[PDB]
Amino acid sequence: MALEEFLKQIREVWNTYELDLVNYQNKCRLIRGWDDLFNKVKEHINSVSAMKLSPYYKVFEEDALSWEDKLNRIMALFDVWIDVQRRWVYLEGIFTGSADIKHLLPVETQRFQSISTEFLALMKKVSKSPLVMDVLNIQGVQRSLERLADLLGKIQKALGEYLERERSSFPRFYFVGDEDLLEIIGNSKNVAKLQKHFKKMFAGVSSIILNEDNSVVLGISSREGEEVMFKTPVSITEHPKINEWLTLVEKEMRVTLAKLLAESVTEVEIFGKATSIDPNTYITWIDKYQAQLVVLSAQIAWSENVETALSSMGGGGDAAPLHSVLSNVEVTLNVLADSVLMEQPPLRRRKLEHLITELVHQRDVTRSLIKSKIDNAKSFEWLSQMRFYFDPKQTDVLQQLSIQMANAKFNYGFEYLGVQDKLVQTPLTDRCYLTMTQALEARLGGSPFGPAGTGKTESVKALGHQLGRFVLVFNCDETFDFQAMGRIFVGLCQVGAWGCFDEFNRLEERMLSAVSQQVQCIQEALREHSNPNYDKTSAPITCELLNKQVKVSPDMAIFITMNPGYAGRSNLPDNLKKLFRSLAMTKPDRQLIAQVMLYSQGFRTAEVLANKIVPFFKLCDEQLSSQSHYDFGLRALKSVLVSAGNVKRERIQKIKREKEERGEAVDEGEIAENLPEQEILIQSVCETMVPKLVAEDIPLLFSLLSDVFPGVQYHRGEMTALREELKKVCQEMYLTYGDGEEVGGMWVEKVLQLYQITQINHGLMMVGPSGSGKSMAWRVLLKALERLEGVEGVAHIIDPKAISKDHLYGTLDPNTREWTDGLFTHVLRKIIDSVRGELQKRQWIVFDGDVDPEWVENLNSVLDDNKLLTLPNGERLSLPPNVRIMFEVQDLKYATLATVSRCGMVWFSEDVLSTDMIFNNFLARLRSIPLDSPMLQIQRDAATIMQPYFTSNGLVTKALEHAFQLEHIMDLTRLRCLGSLFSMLHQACRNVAQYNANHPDFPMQIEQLERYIQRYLVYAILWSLSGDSRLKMRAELGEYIRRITTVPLPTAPNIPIIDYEVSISGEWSPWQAKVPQIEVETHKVAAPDVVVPTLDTVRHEALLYTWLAEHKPLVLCGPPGSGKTMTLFSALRALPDMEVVGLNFSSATTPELLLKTFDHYCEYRRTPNGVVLAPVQLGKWLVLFCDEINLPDMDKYGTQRVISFIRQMVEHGGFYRTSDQTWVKLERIQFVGACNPPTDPGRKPLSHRFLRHVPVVYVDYPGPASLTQIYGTFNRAMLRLIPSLRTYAEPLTAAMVEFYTMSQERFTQDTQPHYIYSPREMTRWVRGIFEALRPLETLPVEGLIRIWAHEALRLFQDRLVEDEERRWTDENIDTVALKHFPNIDREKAMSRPILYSNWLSKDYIPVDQEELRDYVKARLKVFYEEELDVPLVLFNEVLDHVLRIDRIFRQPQGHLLLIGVSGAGKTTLSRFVAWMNGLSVYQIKVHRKYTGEDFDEDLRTVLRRSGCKNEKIAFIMDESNVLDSGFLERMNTLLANGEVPGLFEGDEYATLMTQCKEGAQKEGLMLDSHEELYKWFTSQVIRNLHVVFTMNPSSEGLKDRAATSPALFNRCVLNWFGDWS
Amino acid sequence: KELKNIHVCLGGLFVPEAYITATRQYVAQANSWSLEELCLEVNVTTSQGATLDACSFGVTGLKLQGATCNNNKLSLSNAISTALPLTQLRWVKQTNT
Amino acid sequence: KDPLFRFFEREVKMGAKLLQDVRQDLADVVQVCEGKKKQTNYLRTLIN
Amino acid sequence: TSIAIGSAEGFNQADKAINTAVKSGRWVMLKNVHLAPGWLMQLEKKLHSLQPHACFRLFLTMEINPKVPVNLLRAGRIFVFEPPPGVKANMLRTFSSIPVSRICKSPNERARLYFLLAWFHAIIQERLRYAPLGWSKKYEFGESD
Ligand SMILES: Nc1ncnc2c1ncn2[C@@H]1O[C@H](COP(=O)(O)OP(=O)(O)OP(=O)(O)O)[C@@H](O)[C@H]1O
Ligand SMILES: Nc1ncnc2c1ncn2[C@@H]1O[C@H](COP(=O)(O)OP(=O)(O)O)[C@@H](O)[C@H]1O
Ligand SMILES: Nc1ncnc2c1ncn2[C@@H]1O[C@H](COP(=O)(O)OP(=O)(O)O)[C@@H](O)[C@H]1O
Ligand SMILES: Nc1ncnc2c1ncn2[C@@H]1O[C@H](COP(=O)(O)OP(=O)(O)O)[C@@H](O)[C@H]1O
Ligand SMILES: [Mg+2]
Ligand SMILES: [Mg+2]
C-alpha cells in the first residue's frame, strides 16, 4: 500500500509548497527558485510513471491520471512564466531607465505600459495567494501568460533602432547580439546579471569585481580567475548610464595595466643583469603580476639588456657582453625549468609555461646574434627581431611602451587578454610577425594563406595579443553579405580592434568585390591618419561605411586567412588582393614546437622526445594507408603533446597519492627523475591516434612505435567502474557486451576509445560504414556516464543535410537585418543561456548525417581553440565546457582537411558489429518486448525454436554470406536483410497468436509451432536475402539453402522453394493453390483496380502485407509499369485501417512537399511528451507512397535532402519543425517507396544509411506466360459482348503478347528517352478494344482485327520518331495479324488508312478518309466563324492528329504530350478538337513579370472551374511557359494525382471548401466534412481537367524533362508530331 | 632479402615517398639509430657495374633535368633530360659537416 | 617489423584492386559494344 | 567615382554615378563588372540610347571572361592588360609607372637601387612565363610587389 503513502506524501508536499517571492526596487515580488520547482515536478512525474509501471496502479489509476494532468498544467504554466518574468524584467529595465525611447518609439512604449499593468495585476493577484494550486487554478492563467509572452516578444523585435543608437554610443556593443544587448541595457541596475555578457565584449574580461554595495567597480577578472585591481576604483553611482561607466571601466583597466606593467618592469630589472636569481623571489614576482604582464616585463628586460650590450660594442673591437645576457637568460631558464618539475598551482604553472616559451625564444635569438658577430644596434640582424622599448619618463602611461619590428612602430593597446596560450616563436612565426607588421606599417591587410593546420589564425591571434590588441575571429561563410560585413567593419573601426576573417574566400565572389570598397576606404582613412601632420585637436579621420561617417581608430587592422585550392571556395578579385600582403604558411617548424612544448611541460628529455616524435608523424603520414579521415598535421601533434602533459601530471599525482597512502615519503626530484617519459608519450600517441586507425593500420603503427620508441609498451588502464556501467547499460538495452576477445570486445573497446576522445576533444567524428554500432556506441556511453558520474546526460540529434543550411544555422533578412535563429544555433544559444540549468548537464550535439564543406565549414571556429560560433550579424557564441560536438557519418569522402584535422576520429569498421551481436540483440528484444501474457509465451517459445539457426556458422549466417555473391538491384547491406528477416519473423509470431485467438478451445501445440517456425524461417530467409533480385538469383539462393540446410523442404524436383508458402498448419503449400482462373466481369475489364491474380502477384501481396503489418517502411524497385503501384494498392486493400496518400517525387523534390502533405492530411498537437504529428482521422494509419523516390537530385556532395529527411523521420521517429525548431515525433505514419532500378537513366542510387531500414522487393516484368494468362483472362472477359468472336480470344491475346514483346525488344531507352514499353500498353490496348466493342451488337473477325491494329498503331506508333521505325511497326502489325489470324480477308481488315472516329456516327466505327475530311472542313468553317479565324490547310496527317487528340480528350484523366517542331499547328489543332468536344481552352498568359505566384493563381482558377463548376477545360501549356522548376513540379503533381496538396491554404482553402460544398449540392451529393469534399473535388478535377503539353523535339531537353517531371511520360499520352513530312 | 635486393622504378610505384620511408626505416632498424641521424648517400652508376651493400637500394628511371652526372659529379648541360642509369641510395650517420 | 613489406603490401593491394576494376570496366565496355548487355548510368558515363 | 560591382547597393550607386556623370562630365569606373553579365547587358542598352557630356568617360575594368556579353564588347573599346612581352618592355613599363620626381630624390644612389629593383622584378616576372623550370607554380608576382 506504499502507493497511497507516497501519494499522500506528494499531496502534503504540494499543499505545503508556497511560491517564493522576492522584491524588485519596490515594484513587484518576483518568483525565485525555478530549478527547485522544476526538478520537484520532474521527480514527481517520474514517481507517478513508476507507479503506473506497478501492477497495483489500477486501483489508483484515476487519481494518478488527474495528478499527472495537474502536474502537466504546472509544467505548461511555468515553462512560459519564467520567460515572461525575465523578459518583463529586462524590458522594464529599458522602458524605465531610458527616457529617449519614450519620444523615439512612443506607441509600443504605451503598449508595454499596458502589458506591464496587466503583468503587475497578475503578480499582485499571485502575491495575495502564494500557494501553487491557487495560482494554477486561476481562470485563463495559461492564456494570459501566452498572450503576455506574445506581446512582449512583439515589442522586443521592435527595438532595433534604439539598439543601433546604443551600439553607436558605446563601440564595443557592436559584438553583442539582440537579446544580449537588451539584457545588458535592462539589467544595468542589476549588474550581477551582466557578468555573463562581458566575455563577448572584451578580450579576456569574463567578469568584473564589485564591492558589497555593488556600486563601485573594483576591478576585472578572467575565466581562469586572474584578477586585475584598479588603482582608482570607478563608482557606477556617479555614472548611472551603462555606457559611461563601461567606458570608464575600460579606460581604468588600460591605465592600471600600464601602471602595473611599469612596476613589474622596475621590479624585474633586478632579476636582469644579475649573476644569480633566488627562486623564491622570482616565484613571488611571477605570482604577483598577471601572465601577460610578466611576459611583457621579461621581454622588455631582455630587449633593453641586449640593446645596452650591443651599444657597448659600437667600436667593433670591444668585448662581448652579449655572453653575459645569454648566460643570464640561460640561468633564468634553468630556474623556471627546475620550478616546473615540481608542483605548482594551475595559474602559476601556465605563467611558467608562457615565460619558458618566451625565454626559449630569447635564448635562440641571442645565440643567433652572438653567432652572427653582430656589434651594432642598427644592424638588421637585430632590427628584424621584435624589440620592446620602455619609457618610464613618458607622461602618458599608455605611451610608456613601444613595440618595434624592422621599421614598424606600435603602441601596446593595454587590453587585458587574460591567460592565453602563447605559440612557440618558430622561424615561420617570426616571418609571419615581420610580414604582418610590414603590412600594418603600409596600412594594408595581412593575408596568410596555405593548407589548413599550419597555424595561420593562431599566428595572427598571437601577434595581435603581442601588441595587446583586441583580436576577433569571424568564421566567414557565404551569408556574410555586404551589409553584415559593413556592420562588422564599423564595429572594428569604432572599437579599435583587429579583425581576423578566417576562411575569407568562402564568401561569394561578388560579395568579395563589394567588400573591396569598404576595405579600400578604411585603408585610405588609416593611411591619412598615420600622417604626422594630423593632430588630436582635429576630428579623427571619419571614413564612410554603409553611407555613414564612422570614426576610425588607429589601432584597428584587417586580417584575412584563406585556404586556397579546396572545395566551397571562391577566387579573390585582384582589386581586393592588392590590399592585402599575402604570406605563405605551408611547413610549420613541427620539431621546434614539440621540443619547446615538452620542455615547458617539465620533460627532462624534451629534445630526444621531439626528435623521436616529429619524424614519427611523418612516418605515419607516409606509411599508413591513405584514408579520407586520417590527419597527421600540426593540430594532431598539438593534441598529442597536450595529452602527454596531462598524462604526466596525472601519473605524478597518482605516484604522490600512492606514496602518501603507503607511508610518508615524497620527493619531487625523485618522482621527476624516475618517470618514464617514453611511456607517457607512447600512451598519449596511442590514446589519440589508435581510435582513428583502420583494422589493418593498427599493427603497422604499433610496429612503427616499437621501431621509433623501442623498449616501451602500452598498457591501457581497465576502467572497471566504466566497464561495470557499460555492462549494466547493455543489459538494460538488450545489447551484447563482452570484455576483451569475447563477442563484443571490439565494440566496447571502441566505446572506451570514444570516451577517451570525448575526454580530450570537444569535437568528435564517429566514422564508419552504416551498420557498425556508432549510434549505439555513443548512446550507451552517454547513459553509462550519466549513471556513473551522477550528472544527467542529454543529446540533441540533428540531421544537418535533412534541412537547408539557412534552417540549420539561421538567416538574416536582407530587408530589415533581423536575425532568426536556425536549428543548431537555437540549441547552442539555449544551452548557453542555461535558463533551465542546461550547463550542469552533459550536453552532446550529434550531427547524424552527411558532411560537406558547405555546412560544416561554418563550424571551423567551434572545433578550433576559439570554441566560438560566429554569426553574420557579428554575434559570437562561446562553447560551454560541457558541450561536445559529435558527427556520426558513414564516410568522409567530401569533407575538406580543415574539418578532418579538427575532430577526433574514431573508426568503426563493419567487423566491430559482428553478426552474432545483431542476432543476440534480436533474440533478446524478441524475448523481452511484447509484440502486441500469451504474446510473451508464444514469442519466447519462437525465440527458443529459432536459437539453433541464429548462431555463428549457422544457416542464417551462411545464407547471408552467400547472399552478397548474388546480383541485386540495389546494393546489399547486412542490416537491410537482417531487419527484413526480423520483421517477417515478428509477423510469423503474430500469425501464431492469431491462429491461437481463432481457436480458443485448441491453442497451438509445440510440434505445430516448431515446424511452422522452421519453415517460416527458411521462407523469410529466402524472401529477405533475395527479394530484391531477379528470379534466377532467387532460384540459386533456394538451391544453395536446400544444399546446406537440414529442415524439411518441398519434395518437388524442379519447382523452386520460393514458389511455396508456410501455411499455419506447419507444412509447405505451393502458391499456385492460391491462383484461381477467375473470370473478370465484362464491365470491369482492365479496370484500374482490377488485378488478375498470378504467382508473382500473390507472393508480392503476401510479402507487402507482412511488411506493412509491422509498419516497417519498404521500397518496391522495378522497371516502369511492372506493377509496383498495382501490387501495393492490392495489398493495402487487405488492411482496412491504412489510408494511402499519393506522393510523386521528381528531380526537384524537396522536404517541403512532405511538409505540405503533413499539413494537409495530419495535424500538430501539443502533448506532455512534446509535439506529435498524427493523421486527422482517429485510428487510421497514413501511408505515404512515394512513386519516384530516387529521382531527387544528388548534390555535388552525394546527398539527397528529401532522402535524408525520410531517413531521419524513419530512424529517429520524427523530424524538426523549422518554424520554432521543436522536435516533432511521428505517430501512425509509414512510408512506401517505388522506384526504377538505379541503372536506369536519371535514377540515383539510395544512400546505404537509408537502405538499412527499408526492405527492397524487386517487381520484374511479368513473363510471357504471366502476360498470356492475365490478358487471356481480360480478352475472354471482354469478348463476351460478341458471342460469335468468343473463339478468337486465345489467338488475339497471343498476337497482342507477341507484338508487345517484339516492340519491347526492338525499341529500347537507348534510342530515345520515351521508348518505354510495359504492361500498361497492354492494359490501354484492352481498354481501347473493349471501348470500341462495347456499343456494337455484332462484328465479324475482320472488324476485330481492324480495331486491334488501330489500337496497336495508336499505342506503339504514336510515340515513334524515325520513319523507318513506323514502317517497321506497320509491317510487324501486318505480319503478326497474318500469323495469328490466317484465312481472313486482309484488305477489308488491314487497309492502310486505319481510322476510327465517333464523329460521323453515335458509335466508334471505322471511317473512310474522304467523308471525315469533308466533315472536318465543315467543322473548320464553323470554328472559323465562331472562335479562331485562322485558315488551315487539311492533309492526311492533320486528320490523324485530330483523331488522336479527340481520342485522348474522351478518356478520363487523359492528358496529351505533343512533340514536334514549332509552327506545326499543335496548339491550333488542340484548340480545334477541344472546341468540338466542348472543352473550354485555358492558356496561361506569360509575361516578363510572370512568377510562381501567378502560376499558382492560374492553377487555382483552373481547378476551381474544373472541379467546382464541372466545366471541362483543355489546359494547353507550352514549354516556353516553364520559367521555373516550380511550374514543372506543380504540373507534375497535378498530372499524376489530379490535385495539388499545398496549392490551397488559408483563405483560399476555405473558399475552395465552400465552392466544393456548393458544387456537391448542385450535383445533389450530401457531403459536409472537408476530407470527403476534397476527395469529390479531386474526382471532379480528374474527370474534367485535361492538360495538353506542347514542346519542341529537343534531344537533351526530352531527357531532362524525363527526370524533372516523370508524369509527362507516365500519365500523358505522347504524340510525336515532328516536322511536316 | 629478395625484396631489398631487387631494383624498383620509383615512377611506377603509387607512393614512391613511402618506399623511401620504408627503406629509411629498414636501414635504421639495421643500424638501430634514429631517423634524424640518417642522411642520403646517392651514387649514380651503370646497372652492370653496380654493387649493393646492406644499406644500398636500387632505383631506376630517375631523370635528370638540365644536367649530366658523370662519375657521381654533375655538369650543366643543354640537354633537356638525362636518364640516370641506376640510382643507388644509402642511409648513413649524419656528420653535421 | 619490416617497413619495406609494410609499404610493399600496400603497393600490391592497390595494384590488384585497380587492375581488377579497370579490367572489369573495360570488359563491360566490350560487352556493351557487342550489345550483349545494357548500359547503366556508371557504364554510360564511362563510355562517355 | 569608382564603384565595385557585386551588390545591389553597388548597382544603385553605379547607376546614380553614371546618371550624374553624363551631365557633370566626371569620370566613372566600375570594377569586376564581369560578375554581373545581365547588368552589363542592361547597362549597354542604357548606354546606346544616351547623349553624354564631352568630358564624360566610363571605365569597365573586368577579368577576361567568356560570360561578358558580346554586345557590350562590341559597344566599347577593349584594352588588354597582361604581362609585358619581354624584359626590356617590363623595365620600360616599370620606369613609366614610377614618377620621375620619386626616383630623382636627394640621395644620388636611389636611382641605381630603383634600376636594380626594376631589373629584379623584370627577371622574376619573365621567369614566370616558364612554369615548370623558371618557377614551380604560377606565382602572383605583380605590380603590388
Ligand atoms: N553492442 C551491441 N550488441 C548487439 N547489437 C548491437 C550492439 N550495438 C548495436 N547493435 C545493433 O546493431 C545495429 C546497428 O545500429 P546502430 O544505429 O548503432 O548502427 P550504426 O553503425 O551507427 O548505423 P548508421 O550508420 O545507420 O547510423 C542495430 O540493429 C543495433 O540494435
Ligand atoms: N608556433 C606554434 N606553437 C605552438 N603551437 C602552434 C603554433 N602554431 C600553430 N600551433 C597550433 O596549431 C593549431 C593551428 O590552428 P589554426 O591556426 O586555426 O590553423 P589554420 O589557421 O591554418 O586553420 C593551433 O591549435 C595551435 O595550437
Ligand atoms: N496480374 C495483373 N493483372 C492485371 N493487370 C496487371 C497485372 N500485372 C500488371 N498489370 C497492369 O500493369 C500496370 C502496372 O501499372 P503500375 O502499377 O502503375 O506500374 P508502376 O507502378 O511500375 O508505374 C497496371 O495498369 C495493370 O493494369
Ligand atoms: N494545316 C495547316 N494549314 C495551314 N496553316 C497551318 C496549319 N497548321 C498550322 N498552321 C499555321 O500555324 C499557326 C499556328 O501555330 P501554332 O499551332 O501556334 O504553333 P505551335 O503548334 O508551335 O504552338 C497558324 O497561324 C496557322 O496559320
Ligand atoms: Mg585557421
Ligand atoms: Mg547508427
Angle among Cα A601, A606, A612 to the nearest 5 degrees reads 125
Tell me the C-alpha distance between A270 and A248, whole Å.
34
Residues A949, A956 contacting (CB under 8 angstroms)? yes
CA distances from A292 to A299, A359, A466, A749, A979 (A): 10, 14, 9, 43, 61
Residues A1528, A1597 contacting (CB under 8 angstroms)? no
Tell me the C-alpha distance between A863 and A859, whole Å.
6
Task: Region of A388 please: left (phi>0), alpha (psi -120 to 50) or beta.
Answer: beta
**A159 min Cα distance to partner chain D (Å):** 25
Residues 6+ apart with CB under 8 A from A1218: A803, A807, A823
Least CB–CB distance from D6: residue in A483, A510, A578: A510
The cell numbers describing A921, all together, are 540483440
The helix, strand and coil proportions of chain C, stated in percent and rounded to the nearest 5, come to: 80, 0, 20
A918 CA to centre of ligand 1 in angstroms: 8
Which residues make beta-bridge pairs with A1480? A1513
Tell me the C-alpha distance between B90 and B72, whole Å.
14
- Residue A999 CB coordination number (10 Å): 11
Tell me the C-alpha distance between A979 and A1107, whole Å.
10
Tell me the C-alpha distance between A550 and A566, whole Å.
36
Q: Is the CA virtual torsion A1001, A1002, A1004, A1005 positive or negative?
A: positive
Question: What is the secondary structure of A858-916 as a DSSP string?
Answer: GGHHHHSSS-EEE-TTS-EEEPPTTEEEEEEES--SS--HHHHTTSEEEE--TTTS-HH
Backbone angles phi, psi at A1030, to 5 degrees: -70, 180
CA distances from A1554 to A1401, A1503, A1539, A1549, A1579 (A): 41, 14, 17, 9, 17
Question: Is A1512 close to ligand 3, i.e. is its CB under 6 Å away?
Answer: no
Packed helices A745-760 and A774-789: angle between N→C axes, nearest 10 degrees: 60
Question: Is A747 close to ligand 1, i.e. is its CB under 6 Å away?
Answer: yes
Is A1308 part of the contact surface with chain C (CB cutoff 8 Å)?
yes
CA nearest neighbour of A440 among A498, A377, A508: A498
Q: Is D41 helix (H, G, I), strand (E, B) or coil?
A: helix
CA nearest neighbour of A888 among A854, A858, A850, A844: A850
CA nearest neighbour of A800 among A868, A729, A888: A888
Using CA coordinates, name the residue in chain C closest to A619: C3
Question: Is A1465 close to ligand 4, i.e. is its CB under 6 Å away?
Answer: yes
Residues A446, A559 contacting (CB under 8 angstroms)? yes
Burial A170-206 (b: 16+ CB within 10 A, else e): bbbbbbbbbbbbbbbbbbbeebebbebbbbbbbbbbb
Residues A1541, A1144 contacting (CB under 8 angstroms)? no
Q: Is the CA virtual torsion A1085, A1086, A1089, A1090 positive or negative?
A: positive
Side-chain-side CA neighbours of A637 within 13 Å: the count stands at 29
CA distances from A780 to A732, A740, A755, A1362 (A): 10, 18, 11, 64
Q: Which residues are within 5 Å of ligand 6 (an ion), measured at CB?
A: A 774-775
Q: Where are the alpha helices (DSSP H) in A1261-1401?
A: 1264-1278, 1289-1306, 1319-1333, 1341-1356, 1363-1380, 1386-1389
- The full length of chain D comes to 145
To one decimal place, what's the resolution in Å?
A: 3.4
CA nearest neighbour of A620 among A538, A701, A530, A733: A701
Residues A218, A272 contacting (CB under 8 angstroms)? no
Question: What is the secondary structure of B56-89 as a DSSP string?
Answer: -EEEE--EEEEEEEETTEEEEEEEEEEE-S-EEE
Question: What is the secondary structure of A489-553 as a DSSP string?
Answer: HHHHHHHT-EEEEESGGGS-HHHHHHHHHHHHHHHHHHHHHTSTT--SSSPP-EEEETTEEEE--
Q: Which ligand is nearest to the CA of A1516?
A: 4
The cell numbers describing A20, all together, are 517564493
CA distances from A294 to A282, A419, A1123 (A): 11, 11, 81
The helix, strand and coil proportions of chain D, stated in percent and rounded to the nearest 5, come to: 50, 10, 40
Q: What is the DSSP letter of A625?
A: P
CA A46 from chain center: how many Å? Answer: 32
CB spacing of D4 vs A514 below 8 angstroms: yes
Q: Is A1332 helix (H, G, I), strand (E, B) or coil?
A: helix
Residues 6+ apart with CB under 8 A from B32: none
Tell me the C-alpha distance between A1402 and A859, whole Å.
73
Question: Is A593 close to ligand 2, i.e. is its CB under 6 Å away?
Answer: yes
Q: Which ligand is nearest to the CA of A1100?
A: 3
Residues A196, A205 contacting (CB under 8 angstroms)? no
Backbone angles phi, psi at A811, to 5 degrees: -150, 160
Is A39 part of the contact surface with chain C (CB cutoff 8 Å)?
no
Tell me the C-alpha distance between A526 and A524, whole Å.
5
The cell numbers describing A1399, all together, are 464523329
The cell numbers describing A904, all together, are 577526433
Tell me the C-alpha distance between A514 and A516, whole Å.
5
Tell me the C-alpha distance between A88 and A96, whole Å.
12
- Residue A1566 CB coordination number (10 Å): 7
Tell me the C-alpha distance between A290 and A204, whole Å.
12
Write the single-letter amino acid at A425. Answer: Q
Residues A763, A863 contacting (CB under 8 angstroms)? yes
Residues D79, D107 contacting (CB under 8 angstroms)? no
Write the single-letter amino acid at A1344. Answer: L
Q: Where are the alpha helices (DSSP H) in A170-241?
A: 178-186
CA nearest neighbour of A988 among A1106, A1102, A1097: A1106
CA nearest neighbour of B38 among B81, B90, B97: B90
The cell numbers describing A208, all together, are 568584473
Residues A901, A453 contacting (CB under 8 angstroms)? yes
List chain A residues with CB under 8 Å of D10.
482, 514, 517
Residues A557, A408 contacting (CB under 8 angstroms)? no
CA nearest neighbour of A105 among A150, A44, A181, A165: A165
Residues A1088, A1229 contacting (CB under 8 angstroms)? no
User: Do at least 3 CB pairs under 8 Å connect C with D?
Assistant: no
Which residues make beta-bridge pairs with A888? A766, A848
CA nearest neighbour of A805 among A793, A822, A821: A822
Q: Which ligand is nearest to the CA of A429?
A: 2
Query: Residue of the nearest CA to atom 29 in ligand 1?
Result: A918
**A104 min Cα distance to partner chain D (Å):** 28
- The full length of chain B comes to 97
Tell me the C-alpha distance between A1588 and A1474, whole Å.
10
Question: Is A771 close to ligand 1, i.e. is its CB under 6 Å away?
Answer: yes
List chain A residues with CB under 8 Å of D32.
510, 513, 516, 573, 575
**Counting Cβ atoms within 10 Å, is residue A231 exposed (0-12), middle (13-18) or buried (19+)?**
exposed
CA A362 from chain center: how many Å? Answer: 49
Q: Is A1062 helix (H, G, I), strand (E, B) or coil?
A: strand
Side-chain-side CA neighbours of A901 within 13 Å: the count stands at 20
A1252 CA to centre of ligand 6 in angstroms: 10
Tell me the C-alpha distance between A588 and A594, whole Å.
11
Annotated binding residues of A: 450-457, 768-775, 1118-1125, 1460-1467
Provide Rg for chain B, Cα atoms.
14
CA nearest neighbour of A1209 among A799, A837, A679: A799
